Amino acid sequence: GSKGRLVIYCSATNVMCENAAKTFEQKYDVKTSFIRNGSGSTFAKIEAEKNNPQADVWYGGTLDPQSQAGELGLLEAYRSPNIDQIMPKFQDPAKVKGNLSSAVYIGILGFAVNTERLKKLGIEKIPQCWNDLTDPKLKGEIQIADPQSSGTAYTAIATFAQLWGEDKAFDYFKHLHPNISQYTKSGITPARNAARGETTVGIGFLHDYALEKEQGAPLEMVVPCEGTGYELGGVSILKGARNLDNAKLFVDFALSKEGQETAWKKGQALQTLTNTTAEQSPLAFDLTKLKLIDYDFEKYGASDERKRLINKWVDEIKLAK
Numbered sequence: 001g002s003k004g005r006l007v008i009y010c011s012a013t014n015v016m017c018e019n020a021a022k023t024f025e026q027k028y029d030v031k032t033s034f035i036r037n038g039s040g041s042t043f044a045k046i047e048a049e050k051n052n053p054q055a056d057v058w059y060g061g062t063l064d065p066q067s068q069a070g071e072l073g074l075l076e077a078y079r080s081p082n083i084d085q086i087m088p089k090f091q092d093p094a095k096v097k098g099n100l101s102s103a104v105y106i107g108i109l110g111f112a113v114n115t116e117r118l119k120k121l122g123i124e125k126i127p128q129c130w131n132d133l134t135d136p137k138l139k140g141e142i143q144i145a146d147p148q149s150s151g152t153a154y155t156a157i158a159t160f161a162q163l164w165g166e167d168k169a170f171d172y173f174k175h176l177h178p179n180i181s182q183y184t185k186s187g188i189t190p191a192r193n194a195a196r197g198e199t200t201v202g203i204g205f206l207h208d209y210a211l212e213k214e215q216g217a218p219l220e221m222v223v224p225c226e227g228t229g230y231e232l233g234g235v236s237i238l239k240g241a242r243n244l245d246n247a248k249l250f251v252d253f254a255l256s257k258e259g260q261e262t263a264w265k266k267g268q269a270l271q272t273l274t275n276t277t278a279e280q281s282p283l284a285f286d287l288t289k290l291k292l293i294d295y296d297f298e299k300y301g302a303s304d305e306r307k308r309l310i311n312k313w314v315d316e317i318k319l320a321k
């Protein structure tokens, strides 16, 4: 009873990806496989493969590189009927309109603190603001990912540019740098290392920290006092997808009540869902309760900002010097 196939480039966590693929395969009899890689890493792969695309759909990870892929003609437009159920402000959020990319979840940018480690290091108060993370007492005690690979890291750079302006954002990263022990390849690695007690502060998306906390890690999550940004998780069909009808079916599924709910019910992924008919995890953040910027996906999900800010970060924040 096999009904074709589907290849997914996934940029969410392995557990979320595997659950989505298995659930889709069992529901629709589509032989479904995925390859997981960072949001930025996946963008580069898709761009390199554009003359002979090797996947059908790009699922999860942050919207900005999917929006950039749309701008560059790497995607195939498709508006799912399930867009009707998506939070109106997020129905068609990318730079090029027409649902070349669609929003499947929301992740809040912030940081979390291993409180056992903070204590075991002699620091009395938990950082509450982005500003607090440049405190010299945190030298070598913070981790964040590298935006060459990680969507999360780019969401942070773009958030900081939107909060403070680009110049002061790069001032901030200059001051944050001495406190970073490791720039990680994956967005989620600071959460894992903070949970493990290998680092004291991780910067990333708070739902990853919430999952670690739910599993017993001594973490305190912080929505920084100045305000913060967020990812939209993206789903996009690749231009030249060999399995186009099945790709459209997967976009429908990813935007559906069932497909989104299964992320937190079975896929160990606690992002806030964009489908207004879906039940949220009790652990999901509620956007109406948070000090969030109006994150400009049209502006930051574009080559000018993504190439320019990432190359600027590489040049100044870690190379020289």
Ligand SMILES: O=P(O)(O)OC[C@H]1O[C@@H](O)[C@H](O)[C@@H](O)[C@@H]1O
Binding pocket: 011, 012, 013, 037, 038, 039, 040, 060, 061, 062, 107, 145, 149, 150, 151, 152, 153, 185, 186, 187, 188, 205, 208, 231, 233, 269, 271
């Ligand atoms: O930063 P990246 O490696 O691109 O990954 C980004 C992804 O990271 C995960 O850990 C989060 O659960 C996802 O919500 C996010 O989309």
Ligand SMILES: [Cl-]
Binding pocket: 012, 013, 014, 015
């Ligand atoms: Cl993973």
Ligand SMILES: [Cl-]
Binding pocket: 004, 005, 242, 243, 244, 245, 246, 247
């Ligand atoms: Cl197909």
